Scaffold this active site. Structure first.
Site, short mmCIF file in Angstrom:
data_model
loop_
_atom_site.label_atom_id
_atom_site.label_comp_id
_atom_site.label_asym_id
_atom_site.label_seq_id
_atom_site.Cartn_x
_atom_site.Cartn_y
_atom_site.Cartn_z
N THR A 119 -4.92 6.59 8.82
CA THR A 119 -5.57 6.83 7.56
C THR A 119 -5.73 5.58 6.69
O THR A 119 -6.27 5.67 5.59
CB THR A 119 -4.94 7.96 6.76
OG1 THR A 119 -3.60 7.63 6.44
CG2 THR A 119 -5.00 9.31 7.57
N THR A 120 -5.25 4.44 7.16
CA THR A 120 -5.44 3.19 6.43
C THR A 120 -6.04 2.22 7.45
O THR A 120 -5.95 2.44 8.68
CB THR A 120 -4.10 2.60 5.96
OG1 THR A 120 -3.22 2.56 7.09
CG2 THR A 120 -3.44 3.43 4.85
N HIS B 181 0.82 -1.21 0.00
CA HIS B 181 0.00 0.00 0.00
C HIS B 181 0.86 1.28 0.00
O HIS B 181 0.39 2.32 -0.43
CB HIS B 181 -0.95 -0.03 1.21
CG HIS B 181 -1.61 -1.37 1.45
ND1 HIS B 181 -2.74 -1.79 0.76
CD2 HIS B 181 -1.33 -2.36 2.33
CE1 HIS B 181 -3.12 -2.97 1.22
NE2 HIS B 181 -2.28 -3.34 2.17
N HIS C 96 6.32 6.91 6.22
CA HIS C 96 5.88 6.51 4.88
C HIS C 96 5.21 7.69 4.21
O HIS C 96 4.95 8.71 4.85
CB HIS C 96 4.87 5.38 4.95
CG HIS C 96 3.66 5.71 5.76
ND1 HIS C 96 3.53 5.42 7.10
CD2 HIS C 96 2.52 6.34 5.41
CE1 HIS C 96 2.35 5.87 7.50
NE2 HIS C 96 1.70 6.45 6.50
N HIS D 62 4.31 10.85 6.52
CA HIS D 62 3.81 10.62 7.86
C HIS D 62 4.92 9.97 8.68
O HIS D 62 5.45 8.90 8.28
CB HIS D 62 2.58 9.71 7.83
CG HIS D 62 1.36 10.35 7.25
ND1 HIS D 62 0.28 9.62 6.81
CD2 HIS D 62 1.07 11.67 7.09
CE1 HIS D 62 -0.61 10.50 6.39
NE2 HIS D 62 -0.18 11.74 6.54
N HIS E 2 2.30 9.15 0.98
CA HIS E 2 1.06 8.98 0.23
C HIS E 2 1.28 9.96 -0.92
O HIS E 2 1.76 11.08 -0.70
CB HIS E 2 -0.13 9.43 1.04
CG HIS E 2 -0.37 8.58 2.23
ND1 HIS E 2 -1.13 7.44 2.22
CD2 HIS E 2 0.08 8.71 3.51
CE1 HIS E 2 -1.15 6.94 3.45
NE2 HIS E 2 -0.43 7.69 4.26
N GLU F 96 -3.10 13.63 1.81
CA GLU F 96 -4.33 13.19 2.47
C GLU F 96 -5.01 14.41 3.10
O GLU F 96 -6.20 14.67 2.88
CB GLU F 96 -3.97 12.13 3.51
CG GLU F 96 -3.22 10.94 2.90
CD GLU F 96 -3.49 9.68 3.67
OE1 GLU F 96 -3.03 9.51 4.82
OE2 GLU F 96 -4.22 8.87 3.13
ZN LIG Z 1 0.13 7.63 6.22
#
Ligand SMILES: [Zn+2]
EC number: 4.2.1.1
Length: 257
Positions: free
Chosen positions: A195-196, A61, A91, A116, A93, A103
């Site tokens: 957020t996941t 992901h 990580h 993040h 996004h 995000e």
């Molecule tokens: Zn994140």
């Protein structure tokens, strides 16, 4: 099973993770005129001089750089936090295009990517127990915009080749996360969630006002990763971001006026 596609994306997550429609979900849009400047907020204290990076991994992901969190070597304190929080991983996004990818948004504006840095509250003993608490995690969110190259990001960009597909990992030692911080540590803060999936509502979000800039070629490399595992049909890892959730019963506080 969950992902970012038309059939298993954010709009479908609630079926397996009902908390998706919870009261303190992230990300959220930061309305700068509604954010409340709070003078009692202390400055953030980032102590990453003893940080020990170990590995980089493509988890299907996103890609995570992992740190040794067996001792207080890279910590975050101050700001709206009580206690010490240890860095466990960071990580990103990102998007398929430069106009989307972050995000959180600021007055509806989307950035090219969002970093993040994830930290867990040491009073809980380990990351697994921390995610079960309302103040278990502190995530530092940093926006990336496309402009000049970020020298300190290149080491990460050069190793992506090695972890192109889901499940791949590589040794990634001696990486200094201080190279990813903007000059200013001004921030907005609000109570939210991962957020996941599992989308646990255990996060105190600290979103930095100042974005860092990376070059077009740097972000291009992120877009070359794959969601799929080796030997499966190629699905490029792009647009792994969850859209903004309603703010509901929450106030976003600013550390600056
Ligand atoms: Zn994140």
């Amino acid at each position: 099973h969950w992902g970012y596609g038309k059939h298993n994306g954010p709009e479908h997550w609630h079926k397996d993770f009902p908390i998706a429609k919870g009261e303190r979900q992230s990300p959220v849009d930061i309305d700068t005129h509604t954010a409340k400047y709070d003078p009692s907020l202390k400055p953030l204290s980032v102590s990453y001089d003893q940080a020990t990076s170990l590995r980089i991994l493509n988890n299907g992901h996103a890609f995570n750089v992992e740190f040794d969190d067996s001792q207080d070597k890279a910590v975050l304190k101050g700001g709206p936090l009580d206690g010490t929080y240890r860095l466990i991983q960071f990580h990103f996004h990102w998007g398929s295009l430069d106009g989307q990818g972050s995000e959180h948004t600021v007055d509806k504006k989307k950035y090219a990517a969002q970093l993040h840095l994830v930290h867990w509250n040491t009073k809980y003993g380990d990351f697994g127990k921390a995610v079960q608490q309302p103040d278990g995690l502190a995530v530092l969110g940093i926006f990336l915009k496309v402009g000049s190259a970020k020298p300190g990001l290149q080491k990460v960009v050069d190793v992506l080749d090695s972890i192109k597909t889901k499940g791949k990992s590589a040794d990634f030692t001696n990486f200094d996360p201080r190279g990813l911080l903007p000059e200013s540590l001004d921030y907005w803060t609000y109570p939210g969630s991962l957020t996941t999936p599992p989308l646990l509502e255990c996060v105190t979000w600290i979103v930095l006002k100042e974005p860092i800039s990376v070059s077009s070629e740097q972000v291009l490399k992120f877009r070359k990763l794959n969601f799929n595992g080796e030997g499966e049909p190629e699905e490029l890892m792009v647009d792994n971001w969850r859209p903004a959730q309603p703010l509901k019963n929450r106030q976003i506080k600013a550390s600056f006026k």
